[PDB]
Amino acid sequence: GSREEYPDIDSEVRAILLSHAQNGITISSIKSEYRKLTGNPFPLHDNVTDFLLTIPNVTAECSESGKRIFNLKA
Amino acid sequence: GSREEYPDIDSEVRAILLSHAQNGITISSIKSEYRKLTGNPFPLHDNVTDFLLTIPNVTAECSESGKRIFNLKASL
16 A cells, blocks of 8 residues: 555565664664665554565564564564 | 453463464464354454554564464574
């Protein structure tokens, strides 16, 4: 649905995770990383998680801090 | 959570995960399981994924098949 605007969003995002894959990255941190990556703001307001788990190999879970956290497959 | 409305929902779903902790499980499988197990319909309707992700030790993933697969954090 977002791929309407950003046909590369899957790949931009994989790039962000790939970047953060050691500790995995939060959503807010993903949004920020994406601004900084593309020069553009992360397009999704809510149900970011539902969207992210659409991208193959993207994984999610709550950290030690109980924060939701995304990464790719080990 | 929605645990507010549904008294045993937590332990039910965790029971299903625990049973399935080997290969992980989809959402529809989780529902039909919950039915088979409680003889009742799965209570939740909208926003199930955030729910499951609220459960301690759970991990969602997107298979290369496109499937959304829930499981329990692997023990190292």
